[PDB]
């Protein structure tokens, strides 16, 4: 009748979790692949999309650290620091 969506598998094959454990602010994958958008994994990376300009990757520990790391300011989305777009 209703088919269920498949779960997420860590890019390193170390675990399979439902997609509600993706970006849930707890590190479930040894490679950090379940938390690309948060500061939860010690070896993760956050992608600065920097729309219109060169994209950059930063350490996950720099997501919501209150410091402006991406020129588009997208790394600071719930920290209290409001970053201005400085890509130009």
* Ramachandran class of 36: left when φ > 0, alpha when ψ lies in -120 to 50, beta otherwise: alpha
Which tokens go with 41? 């994994």
Any known ligand binding at 62?
A: yes
3 vs 12, beta carbon nearer Ca ion: 12
Q: Does residue 19 belong to the site contacting Ca ion (CB under 5 A)?
A: no
Do 47 and 59 form a contact (C-beta atoms < 8 A)? Answer: no
Q: Does residue 65 belong to the site contacting Ca ion (CB under 5 A)?
A: yes
Round to whole Å and give the CA distance between 79 and 37.
13
Q: Does residue 31 belong to the site contacting Ca ion (CB under 5 A)?
A: no
Q: Does residue 67 belong to the site contacting Ca ion (CB under 5 A)?
A: yes
The neighbouring-strand residues paired with 8 are: 17
Q: Does residue 28 belong to the site contacting Ca ion (CB under 5 A)?
A: yes
Q: Residues interacting with Ca ion, by CB under 5 A? A: 21, 24, 26, 28, 34, 62, 65, 67, 69, 75
């Amino acid at each position: 009748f209703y088919e269920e969506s498949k779960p997420f598998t860590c890019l390193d094959g170390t675990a399979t979790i439902p997609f509600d454990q993706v970006n849930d602010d707890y590190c479930d994958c040894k490679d950090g692949s379940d938390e690309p958008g948060t500061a939860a994994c010690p070896n993760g990376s956050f992608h600065c999309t920097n729309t219109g300009y060169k994209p950059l990757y930063i350490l996950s520990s720099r997501v919501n650290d209150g410091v402006c790391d991406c020129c588009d300011g997208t790394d600071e989305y719930n920290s209290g620091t409001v970053c201005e777009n400085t890509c130009r």
